[PDB]
Design a protein around this nucleic acid. Sequence first.
RNA 1: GUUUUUUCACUGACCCGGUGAGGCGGGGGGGCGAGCCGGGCUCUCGCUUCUGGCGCCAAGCGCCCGGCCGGCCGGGCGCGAC
Lengths: 67, 102, 118, 225, 62
Amino acid sequence: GAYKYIQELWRKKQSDVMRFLLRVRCWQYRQLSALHRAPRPTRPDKARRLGYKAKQGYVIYRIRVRR
Amino acid sequence: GRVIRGQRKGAGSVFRAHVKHRKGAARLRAVDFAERHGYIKGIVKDIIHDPGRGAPLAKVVFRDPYRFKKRTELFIAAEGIHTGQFVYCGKKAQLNIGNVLP
Amino acid sequence: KIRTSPTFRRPKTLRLRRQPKYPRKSAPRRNKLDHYAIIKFPLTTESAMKKIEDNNTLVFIVDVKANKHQIKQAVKKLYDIDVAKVNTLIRPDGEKKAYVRLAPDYDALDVANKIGII
Amino acid sequence: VVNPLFEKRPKNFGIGQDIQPKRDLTRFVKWPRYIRLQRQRAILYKRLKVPPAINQFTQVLDRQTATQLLKLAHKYRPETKQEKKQRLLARAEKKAAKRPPVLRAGVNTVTTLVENKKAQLVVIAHDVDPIELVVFLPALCRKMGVPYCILKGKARLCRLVHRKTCTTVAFTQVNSEDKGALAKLVEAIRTNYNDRYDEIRRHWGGNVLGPKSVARIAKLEKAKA
Amino acid sequence: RGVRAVRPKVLMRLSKTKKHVSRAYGGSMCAKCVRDRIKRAFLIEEQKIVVKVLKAQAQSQK
RNA sequence: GUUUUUUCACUGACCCGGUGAGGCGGGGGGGCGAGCCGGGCUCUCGCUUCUGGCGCCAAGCGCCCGGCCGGCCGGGCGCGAC
C-alpha cells in the first residue's frame, strides 16, 4: 500500500523534498483566511489514522492558530 | 499613581485633531503615465484657507486622461501661485513655480 | 474579449427561485383583524352623541392596530353606509377612538338609531 | 461619386492630448485573492530550487507517445456501473437455466503490484495535488524494474477510469494481439525514464528568475562586455 | 439674471422658462463669461492653425 | 572539497507606499544628431507650455454577410489603438 510510503516520507521533514513542500504550502496557507474549508485532506494518509474516511458528511477545515 | 497628561494624549477621545472644517488632505497628484513619461496640465481653481494649517491650499483641477470626468486636487499652494494659472506636472514639465516635476 | 476596466468584478451568476418540496406552515393564517374584530363598540357619550347629531359622524372605539382605510371598509361593510373621512386618536386609556364622518346622502342620527344607540 | 461630407476625424492619443482608448488591461487587473494566489504559486515553482523528486513530474510523456498510449489503455478500461449489471444480469440467466484483463486504478492497488512485480507499465499523473501520494512511485518502479511514464493530467488519466481524477494507472495482463503495442510502449518509456533515472535524481527544477530580472542582468552583462 | 431667487425644492413647481434664460449656458453661466468663452474657444482654435502652418513650413528646408 | 566568517547584489518570503491595481519590462516599426560609398550598422526621441474655451460613448479604411427588383434598402468583424 502507498500509505506506508506517504507515512515514512512525512517523517523526513528536514529532507529537501518535504522542506520544499512544507515551505510552499506554509506560504500558500498564510495568504488565505485563518479559518477556511479545505476541499480534501492535505494529508489523506494522516487523516485515515485519525478516523477520517472519504465519504459524504466528513468535512476538513484548515484553521491557522497564531503562535 | 495617576497617569500623566501625555499618556492620556495617546488614547485620543479629547486630544484628537479638530478635523470638522479641515478642507480635505493636502495631497500631491497621484503618479500615472502622464506624470512619468511627460506632463499633464491642470487649472488653479481657487487658493483656499484650511483650519489649523498656516499655508493656503490650492484647488487644482486636471482632466482625467482615461475618463471624460474631471479630477480636482488639493496642493499645498506655492508662494506666488494664483487662480486661472496652469499648473503642469510630470517628467517633461518646465522648471517654474507651482509646477510639480520629479 | 479584453478587460476594458482594471477592476475584476463578481460575475452575475444565475440565482433561482424557491420551489419548495413542502410549504413550511400547513395552512395560510386566518385574518384576525376582521370587520367585527376592528370595530368594538360606538361611544354613546355626551361629546359623541353631539358629534352624531351635528357633524353627521359616528364615533367608534376601534382595534389599536387599525388603519383609517381598514375602519372605512369596516364601517361600510357592517352598517351598509359610506364614509367621507375617518379621523382617529388613541385615547389615554389606550384604545383607538375613530371619528367616522359619513357621506352627505346618509344621516348619522338615522343610522345611529339603526345600530341602536340613544 | 463619394460624399464630400464623409471626413477623416483622426484622434491624437498623445499625453494630455485626448482620452485614451479602451485598450487591453488584462495584465493590470486587480484579481481576486485566489487568482493572485494560484498564479504566484506557479511562479514559486520557478524561483525556488525544486528538488528532483518533485521536478521529475515536469518530465512528461510527450504529445505523440501519450496519444499513442491512451489508444491502448482505452481497450483495458474498467467497465461502467451501468455495464456492471449486464454481466450480473447474465449470472441470473445462466443460474436460472473468465474475467478479462483490465487497468488497475489508484496508488494503493498499483503500489502493491509494483512490489508483486505484476505491473508491466505504470502511467503516473504529474498534477497530483499533494505530490507525496505519488513522489516515491517513479523511484519504486526504477528499483523493482517496472517501466513507468508520466502523463499530463490526472483528469485525462481519470477519464480512462469512469471517475474525475486518478493518480496512477498500471497494466498487469493484456490481450495477446495488443501484447506487441505494450512491448513497443515499454521500449520508448524505459529508455526515457527508467534508463536515464540516475540523471533525473540530479535535475533540480526552477532556480529561474523573472523575465524582466533576467533582462536587467542580461543588460548589465552587455554594458560591461 | 432672469432666474427666480427661490428655495431649491420649489424649482419642481416652476416652469422651464422661469429657471433659465434663452441662450447657450443660459441660467447656468453669466453672459459676460459666455462671450469671453466664445472668443477664447475661437482665438485658441485660431492660434492652433498658425502653429499647425508654421510646423509644416519648418520641415521643408531640412 | 567541508564548514565558519566579512563585504558586495539577488528576489522569492517579509515589509512599506500608490492606485478605480490604466500603458510595466523586453522586442518591432517610425523621427533627428553621429558615421563608410541605392545598402546597413554604435545610439537617440516619441505628438499637449502664450489665453480662467472644447475634449468620452470613433471617424476613416479594410473584411464578410441577411429582401425587393447586376443597380436601389441594414448588421457583424478587423485595423485605427503593434
